[PDB]
Amino acid sequence: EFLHAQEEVKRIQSIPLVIGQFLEAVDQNTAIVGSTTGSNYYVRILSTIDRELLKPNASVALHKHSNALV
Amino acid sequence: LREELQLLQEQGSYVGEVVRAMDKKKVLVKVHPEGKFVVDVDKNIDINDV
Amino acid sequence: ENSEKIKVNKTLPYLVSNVIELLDVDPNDQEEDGANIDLDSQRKGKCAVIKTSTRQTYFLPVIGLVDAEKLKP
Amino acid sequence: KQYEKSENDLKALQSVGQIVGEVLKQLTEEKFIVKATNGPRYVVGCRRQLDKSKLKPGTRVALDMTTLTIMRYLPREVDPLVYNMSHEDPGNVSYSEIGGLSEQIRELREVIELPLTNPELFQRVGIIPPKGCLLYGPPGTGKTLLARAVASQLDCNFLKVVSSSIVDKYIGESARLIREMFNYARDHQPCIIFMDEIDAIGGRRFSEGTSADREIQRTLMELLNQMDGFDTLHRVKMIMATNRPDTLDPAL
Amino acid sequence: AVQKVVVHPLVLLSVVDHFNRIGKVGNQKRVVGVLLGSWQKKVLDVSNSFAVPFDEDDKDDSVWFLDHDYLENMYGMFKKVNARERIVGWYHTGPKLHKNDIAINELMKRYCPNSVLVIIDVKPKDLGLPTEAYISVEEVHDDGTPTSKTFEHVTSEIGAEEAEEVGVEHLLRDIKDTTVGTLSQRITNQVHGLKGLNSKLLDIRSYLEKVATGKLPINHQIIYQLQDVFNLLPDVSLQEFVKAFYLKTNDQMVVVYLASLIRSVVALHNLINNKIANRDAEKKEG
Amino acid sequence: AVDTAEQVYISSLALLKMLKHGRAGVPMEVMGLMLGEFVDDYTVRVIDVFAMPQSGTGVSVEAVDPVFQAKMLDMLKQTGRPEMVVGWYHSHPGFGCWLSGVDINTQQSFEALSERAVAVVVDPIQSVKGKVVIDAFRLINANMMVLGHEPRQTTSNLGHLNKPSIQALIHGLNRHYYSITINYRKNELEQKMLLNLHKKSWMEGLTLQDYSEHCKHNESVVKEMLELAKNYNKAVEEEDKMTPEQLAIKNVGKQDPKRHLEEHVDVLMTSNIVQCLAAMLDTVVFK
Amino acid sequence: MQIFVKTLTGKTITLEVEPSDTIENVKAKIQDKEGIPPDQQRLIFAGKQLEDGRTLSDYNIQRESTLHLVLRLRGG
Amino acid sequence: MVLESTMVCVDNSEYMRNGDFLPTRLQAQQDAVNIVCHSKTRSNPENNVGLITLANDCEVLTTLTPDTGRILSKLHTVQPKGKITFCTGIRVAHLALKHRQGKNHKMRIIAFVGSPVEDNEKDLVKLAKRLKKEKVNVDIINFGEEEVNTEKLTAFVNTLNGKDGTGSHLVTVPPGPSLADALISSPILAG
Numbered sequence A: 001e002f003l004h005a006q007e008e009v010k011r012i013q014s015i016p017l018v019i020g021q022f023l024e025a026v027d028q029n030t031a032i033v034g035s036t037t038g039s040n041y042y043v044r045i046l047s048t049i050d051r052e053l054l055k056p057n058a059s060v061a062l063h064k065h066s067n068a069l070v
Numbered sequence B: 001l002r003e004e005l006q007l008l009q010e011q012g013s014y015v016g017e018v019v020r021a022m023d024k025k026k027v028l029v030k031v032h033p034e035g036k037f038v039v040d041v042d043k044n045i046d047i048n049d050v
Numbered sequence C: 001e002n003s004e005k006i007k008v009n010k011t012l013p014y015l016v017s018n019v020i021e022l023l024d025v026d027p028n029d030q031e032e033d034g035a036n037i038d039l040d041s042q043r044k045g046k047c048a049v050i051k052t053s054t055r056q057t058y059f060l061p062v063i064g065l066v067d068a069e070k071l072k073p
Numbered sequence D: 001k002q003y004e005k006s007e008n009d010l011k012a013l014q015s016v017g018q019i020v021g022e023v024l025k026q027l028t029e030e031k032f033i034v035k036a037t038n039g040p041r042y043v044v045g046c047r048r049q050l051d052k053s054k055l056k057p058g059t060r061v062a063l064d065m066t067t068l069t070i071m072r073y074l075p076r077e078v079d080p081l082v083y084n085m086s087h088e089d090p091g092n093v094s095y096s097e098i099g100g101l102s103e104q105i106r107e108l109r110e111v112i113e114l115p116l117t118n119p120e121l122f123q124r125v126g127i128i129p130p131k132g133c134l135l136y137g138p139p140g141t142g143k144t145l146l147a148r149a150v151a152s153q154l155d156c157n158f159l160k161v162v163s164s165s166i167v168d169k170y171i172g173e174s175a176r177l178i179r180e181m182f183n184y185a186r187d188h189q190p191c192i193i194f195m196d197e198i199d200a201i202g203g204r205r206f207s208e209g210t211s212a213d214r215e216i217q218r219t220l221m222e223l224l225n226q227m228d229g230f231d232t233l234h235r236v237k238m239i240m241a242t243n244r245p246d247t248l249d250p251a252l
Numbered sequence E: 001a002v003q004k005v006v007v008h009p010l011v012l013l014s015v016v017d018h019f020n021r022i023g024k025v026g027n028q029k030r031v032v033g034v035l036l037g038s039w040q041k042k043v044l045d046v047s048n049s050f051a052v053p054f055d056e057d058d059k060d061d062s063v064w065f066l067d068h069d070y071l072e073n074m075y076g077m078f079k080k081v082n083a084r085e086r087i088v089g090w091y092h093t094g095p096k097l098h099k100n101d102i103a104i105n106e107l108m109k110r111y112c113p114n115s116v117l118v119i120i121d122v123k124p125k126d127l128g129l130p131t132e133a134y135i136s137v138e139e140v141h142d143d144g145t146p147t148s149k150t151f152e153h154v155t156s157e158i159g160a161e162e163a164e165e166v167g168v169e170h171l172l173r174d175i176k177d178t179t180v181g182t183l184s185q186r187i188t189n190q191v192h193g194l195k196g197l198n199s200k201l202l203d204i205r206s207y208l209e210k211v212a213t214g215k216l217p218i219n220h221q222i223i224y225q226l227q228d229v230f231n232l233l234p235d236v237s238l239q240e241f242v243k244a245f246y247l248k249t250n251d252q253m254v255v256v257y258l259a260s261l262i263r264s265v266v267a268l269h270n271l272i273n274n275k276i277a278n279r280d281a282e283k284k285e286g
Numbered sequence F: 001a002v003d004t005a006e007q008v009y010i011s012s013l014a015l016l017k018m019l020k021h022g023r024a025g026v027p028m029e030v031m032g033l034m035l036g037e038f039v040d041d042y043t044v045r046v047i048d049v050f051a052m053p054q055s056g057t058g059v060s061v062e063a064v065d066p067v068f069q070a071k072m073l074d075m076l077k078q079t080g081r082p083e084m085v086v087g088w089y090h091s092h093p094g095f096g097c098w099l100s101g102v103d104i105n106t107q108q109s110f111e112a113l114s115e116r117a118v119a120v121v122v123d124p125i126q127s128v129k130g131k132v133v134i135d136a137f138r139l140i141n142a143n144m145m146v147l148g149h150e151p152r153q154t155t156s157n158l159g160h161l162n163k164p165s166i167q168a169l170i171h172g173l174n175r176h177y178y179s180i181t182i183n184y185r186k187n188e189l190e191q192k193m194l195l196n197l198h199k200k201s202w203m204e205g206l207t208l209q210d211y212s213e214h215c216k217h218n219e220s221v222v223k224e225m226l227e228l229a230k231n232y233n234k235a236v237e238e239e240d241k242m243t244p245e246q247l248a249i250k251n252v253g254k255q256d257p258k259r260h261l262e263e264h265v266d267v268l269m270t271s272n273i274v275q276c277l278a279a280m281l282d283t284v285v286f287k
Numbered sequence G: 001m002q003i004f005v006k007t008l009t010g011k012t013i014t015l016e017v018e019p020s021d022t023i024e025n026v027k028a029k030i031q032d033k034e035g036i037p038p039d040q041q042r043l044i045f046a047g048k049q050l051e052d053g054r055t056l057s058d059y060n061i062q063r064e065s066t067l068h069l070v071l072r073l074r075g076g
Numbered sequence H: 001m002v003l004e005s006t007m008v009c010v011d012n013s014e015y016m017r018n019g020d021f022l023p024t025r026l027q028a029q030q031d032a033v034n035i036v037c038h039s040k041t042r043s044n045p046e047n048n049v050g051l052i053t054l055a056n057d058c059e060v061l062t063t064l065t066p067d068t069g070r071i072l073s074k075l076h077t078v079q080p081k082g083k084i085t086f087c088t089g090i091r092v093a094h095l096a097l098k099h100r101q102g103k104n105h106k107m108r109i110i111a112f113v114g115s116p117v118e119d120n121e122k123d124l125v126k127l128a129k130r131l132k133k134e135k136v137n138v139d140i141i142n143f144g145e146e147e148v149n150t151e152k153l154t155a156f157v158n159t160l161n162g163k164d165g166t167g168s169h170l171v172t173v174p175p176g177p178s179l180a181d182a183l184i185s186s187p188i189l190a191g
């Protein structure tokens, strides 16, 4: 059921996705990204993303409305 | 994980920099691009921590 | 009834803009039904690209209530 | 007949414009990274039948307004200042009208007219033909008049620049014309560039003067790049004219 | 040659509904329909299907019906709604193929030059891979057959597409499954493997007991082509093959011996990290 | 005359016809009819789904000639049986699966002809390989906006399957229509073959992959597993007394002991065991 | 005279008309029994589209013939 | 105006290749098909016509359709070559007309036999009582040569419509070379 639970999260991408860049991380599962819309946010991240991919200031995807790390 | 799908359909938060605070539990913050705002503090934070 | 309907959807407040250039796209080879759209390749005439006053470029295949001959870039 | 015009306008009303953007790269078979011209970047998809091989890094597409997906790949922009100097010259009597300098009339013919009409003789000796020339002299000797008779032959493939309306009020945006010019000169293959009176944009050098001079010199060095630089040129000829050649940059 | 076909999972289900349409007769009524696919490559694709009326008797299997007029109009509709798609062949639902099944192919080779059948099975009593497909050639024999015409086995597999994997595997939630389980599928795979081995041997001796004694044509088919099967039969435990298991299995034993030697140390980290966290949260609480 | 707790039965062929027509016509609304039977006054059952030739825009979609319509149903009667239209469907690509202002305009057209005409919404974009976002709605009058519309004699269509989503009640629920529940009926015959379509023959169960690459893969994986052990000695010994949520913030980055170390052992286990055990059976069984 | 309007919902609608009547008057009568406006109505007689500018005698539609009623289907 | 489904059984065996009718039997039996399709059209457009042959294969060139222009395309290059085959020729018309679209239409079969049949009387009486069990009326028109002064045919028609039947008839041949309109002078209505 936990592996069925991981797959059902994945509707959140669905490709109308916008692109930001990763900046910093505060604590467990909460970080800061710099969007390509000019401004700067304080977002939440999914438990799915492997944490080895972080800090090159990586290119990241973001939600449109709710603006989280996806 | 099952609860999580609603919580990330929820709006984010801005980040800004405190210039300096003033009286009556307010500060003065330029955000990133825009002007400076006189805003409210939370109930969990203190004025002296700013 | 139509000239009444033209009056309604042609209001006064407008956004002005610039005609950047003009084009003419051809049709394609295959258009299967079910997913058939007239916008894709059912028009072979003229077409234009427009930048607004808000620094935003737009593509429109249907020109509007003007003539493509009278338009220059 | 007037009813037919109204029915065309009934069809015309429900058309919705489309977003213009450029393809950055291909992520997967159905995921694409594009960028709107005004700003931010997106992750998109095509429809089904768009012939996705033609989508390359650097091409231009049209996007849906709401679904925000790729509709059609399109050719390259033109920046209609170029259209204001491409199809703008009116015709002229040919060089039988001019006279008294038939040496220089012949001399221009080998650098422009011959190596595109007859490229074989240059390959036989084995020497690349020259690229650009320079006209100079007192005013009223007919420097502008000579270029009109050359332009009156082609009348389709001739770019004329005043070399003074290039400047602007912004910081970039004067180089951005020059990149668009040579790229338009890249697309059509046998192009002719004509810039009268370089002395506005030309100059020589200043020992760290006004920042406004630095805008001119950075604009000047885009020419010194894109005449020699990395990318070589083919069939691109540049006619240059001025009154005083002493004030010019020796690198030019 | 075609050398495999690719069957999307929208069909194998758009056949069984048509078996469920006329299935109220219960006893026997074979479903025959029209198959739709892609003129792709040497490899071929299968996308869509539809039905066609068909009936046939029990004796004198030469009385059968394919409405050409129904086949012209309804394919003319599917050509109208879909220009990408054209015909590739046909199917029937019969568990074992019948004697009638060659003249049906000989009809519709005038539609596609290589018209291919697909046999499906609504009831796979075999728990193995169903829905196998054939193609007809000519193999004129030493006996003097004017045209030795019999179908040839072609391998096949179930296709996949991004939209249909969504809809199918949503419907798999009515039962439980371990696709994520490593080595739990694997142990079943040799169980599902050797069950297939025993099933083919019980079938072949039933053919072999009949042709030995009393009644069957003893013909110069399988009886020596199956003799070649006995010719291979490797002699496994002999002179130098012993030095293939004692030089190569003990290679793979060391890697397992390495992997256990770390897995025990990894689980030993979780002891001390828990035993520190146990008593030191206790001794500060008290 | 009153409503109830209604229930939308399906066919398994229908949902695959729903999304594949929806996915292939993704950037616009694609339309189709829905074909079934009114089994009682309480539940509804669709068994068939077909589309029609269409013509669309970016904002609207239209059908074309109705001579396709009656001739389609005619040739579905003579092959199989006759049946009944029950409603229709279309897509809302990437939207909040909600009846639009034109989508509602074709419903007083349909509810006046037959009573319980169901509008069905599908989205092949918010649907992942785990689960599908299917949706079906039922128009209600505005003249009975004060009077009750359902008698509510059970709990099955009140608190089950969700409370209505915030992006769908912003247009709809419970104004101008009401939602309806959807389940999945399954005949035994297709249920048995929907179970087994990911298995192979005994050829796949009895392979021995190849011993050159299998030793090469073991030579590969152990080699970086040495390097993972090099990094593992440093970090476990290190342990700055940092109250380990601060250990849990300095590890997002490039840091990865203890995570690949469990991983590659699992790969080296399941590869070597099956490669041995299948080679065991090919001697015991064969000759 | 009587006619028959057969829907795709298996429903038969009978209408008392005249052979000289226009099609839009028949579509008005369908609106009189249903409330469906005539722009949302399509009429098929023997695989043929019917036009409001003609009459029933133009298509040789006579007493107790069978029509086919298809509704407008635009969403969006 | 009445509701039926015309199933015509043409003859392209070899015995049609002679001239005991005036041009050739082929044009003689084609003109018989010309007058019956106009008969079924002017009766009722709801009626429909399908054809079958009695050759080595019993070929459905047209499945049952109300349009007759397709049938007239099939009658050209009919190739009158082959063996007459009878016991499966009714059987392929038997199971064909249970796949009709209008079940109010009566299953009526007409047959054109212009070749000698080698049938047994036992094989046809099995077919005759088979047609009793499904209530099919067949009117056979005889051409040319066959078992002359027809035996096992009048016996077949009578054992088709026995026990208060007489909806099925047997129009024998007029043994004379003449136009096909004189052949259909009595069957212009029925047998």
Ligand SMILES: Nc1ncnc2c1ncn2[C@@H]1O[C@H](COP(=O)(O)OP(=O)(O)O)[C@@H](O)[C@H]1O
Residues within 6 Å of the ligand: D097, D098, D099, D100, D101, D137, D138, D139, D140, D141, D142, D143, D144, D145, D146
């Ligand atoms: N060689 C010549 N023959 C005839 N007319 C000439 C000649 N040279 C100059 N002119 C006259 O000069 C005018 C153009 O001069 P222009 O080309 O502008 O000189 P410059 O380019 O040096 O300023 C023409 O109108 C023409 O009448």
Ligand SMILES: [Zn+2]
Residues within 6 Å of the ligand: F029, F091, F092, F098, F099, F100, F103, G075, G076
């Ligand atoms: Zn909509």
